[PDB]
Design a protein around this nucleic acid. Structure first.
Ligand SMILES: Nc1ccn([C@H]2C[C@H](O)[C@@H](COP(=O)(O)OP(=O)(O)[C@H](F)P(=O)(O)O)O2)c(=O)n1
Ligand SMILES: Nc1ccn([C@H]2C[C@H](O)[C@@H](COP(=O)(O)O)O2)c(=O)n1
Ligand SMILES: [Cl-]
Ligand SMILES: [Mg+2]
Ligand SMILES: [Mg+2]
Ligand code: NA
Ligand code: NA
Ligand code: NA
Length: 326
DNA sequence: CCGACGTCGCATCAGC
DNA sequence: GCTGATGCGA
DNA sequence: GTCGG
């Protein structure tokens, strides 16, 4: 990438603001600037050149000038030296430990991997599984493995009820050569925006995937969202595959296009597109696009019969999934 | 200057 | 138990 | 931290 040094610096700052400062809007600001610089097709020569991009303001322009001149950022060099920031940043790398819990753990003297394993009974269920698979969850998934996983999920879902449709979204649907996890959108004609004519629709799919030993652990689970752990089968004498994060989201079948737009992302693309919708007088979630009144209360859902219909309402040219990796 | 910043599912906890 | 924040996550 | 009214 042309500007990897700058974008890494801004990402590290984003993570600091989220994990340590607990400033979600600074986290989003830094990530938005990193994303716009990542797609800028020139090697940036100055902060002023970067400040022309939307999301890069005066402060980041100054950091870019320091980074270009020296190859580092004194603000980050100091953060890297702060023991509390180091501890908190490490603990938040466990799934289920966020900024609040990380700081509480540090207060209580729990700040290393050894400390965590020593104190499993101080972890909730999600955190306990996140610790169990700490190393695995930072490994990436080759697309070749994503395809094997897709095959298992799609075939097992079909065995439960041929009327299900499972769609792998996330970075996979954007065509990435590797993914951080597997995101599965699920629909069934019995579950629409108008009625739920059959119970346990998500449950019976999860159960089937547990039965064939694909799903191995559960982080959380409700009627429409599963968050868990899965693993490909290995062959005789083969080293096992890493355990992987899996998210499954059951979406009302008639709202598939809003659902698949949401679950395809990226997360920054969704923030950007939804923010553009609001400026255009609309609000978009994973179910609907609705107008806003002069009051600012959402109106009735608008007819959507393609992903492109959603782009049309907000006066955006259509962007294929591969062009949404912001 | 300064209010807004995307939107929502599940787990957990506090107040009643 | 319910309801509404809050945390953490997609 | 940045943007737009
Ligand atoms: N804050 C978020 C996080 C996720 N999402 C949506 C968009 C994501 O593309 C989708 C899956 O979340 P994810 O964290 O797995 O993101 P991916 O796009 O799949 C990443 F590229 P990765 O391949 O590392 O999972 O949920 C979102 O809307 N807002
Ligand atoms: N998980 C899914 C995927 C597609 N669909 C529907 C939405 C459209 O009517 C149609 C689109 O087919 P496809 O996008 O797979 O080419 O399938 C669904 O109901 N659930
Ligand atoms: Cl809605
Ligand atoms: Mg993903
Ligand atoms: Mg704005
Ligand atoms: Na700018
Ligand atoms: Na975490
Ligand atoms: Na995911």
């Amino acid at each position: 990438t042309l500007n990897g040094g700058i974008t890494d610096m801004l990402t590290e700052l984003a993570n600091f603001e989220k994990n340590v400062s607990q400033a979600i809007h600074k986290y989003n600001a830094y990530r938005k600037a990193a994303s716009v610089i990542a797609k800028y097709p020139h090697k940036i020569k100055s902060g002023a050149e970067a400040k022309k991009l939307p999301g890069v303001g005066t402060k980041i322009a100054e950091k870019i000038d320091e980074f270009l001149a020296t190859g580092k950022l004194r603000k980050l060099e100091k953060i890297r030296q702060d023991d509390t920031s180091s501890s908190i940043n490490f603990l938040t790398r466990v799934s289920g430990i966020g900024p609040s819990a990380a700081r509480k753990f540090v207060d209580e003297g729990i700040k290393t991997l050894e400390d965590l394993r020593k104190n499993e009974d101080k972890l909730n269920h999600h955190q306990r599984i996140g610790l169990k698979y700490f190393g695995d969850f930072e490994k990436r998934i080759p697309r070749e493995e994503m395809l094997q996983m897709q095959d298992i999920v799609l075939n097992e879902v079909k065995k439960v009820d041929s009327e299900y449709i499972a769609t792998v979204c996330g970075s996979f649907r954007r065509g990435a050569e590797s993914s951080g996890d597997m995101d599965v959108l699920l629909t069934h004609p019995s579950f629409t925006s108008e009625s739920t004519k059959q119970p346990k629709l998500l449950h019976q799919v999860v159960e089937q995937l547990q039965k064939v030993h694909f799903i191995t652990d559960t982080l959380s689970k409700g009627e429409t969202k599963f968050m868990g752990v899965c693993q490909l089968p290995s062959k005789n004498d083969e080293k096992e595959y890493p355990h992987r994060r899996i998210d499954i989201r059951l979406i009302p079948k008639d709202q598939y296009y809003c659902g698949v737009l949401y679950f395809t992302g990226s997360d920054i693309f969704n923030k950007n597109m939804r923010a553009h919708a609001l400026e255009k007088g609309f609000t978009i979630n994973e179910y609907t696009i609705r107008p806003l009144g002069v009051t600012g209360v959402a109106g009735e859902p608008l007819p959507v019969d393609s992903e492109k219909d959603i782009f049309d309402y907000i006066q955006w040219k259509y962007r294929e999934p591969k062009d949404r990796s912001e």
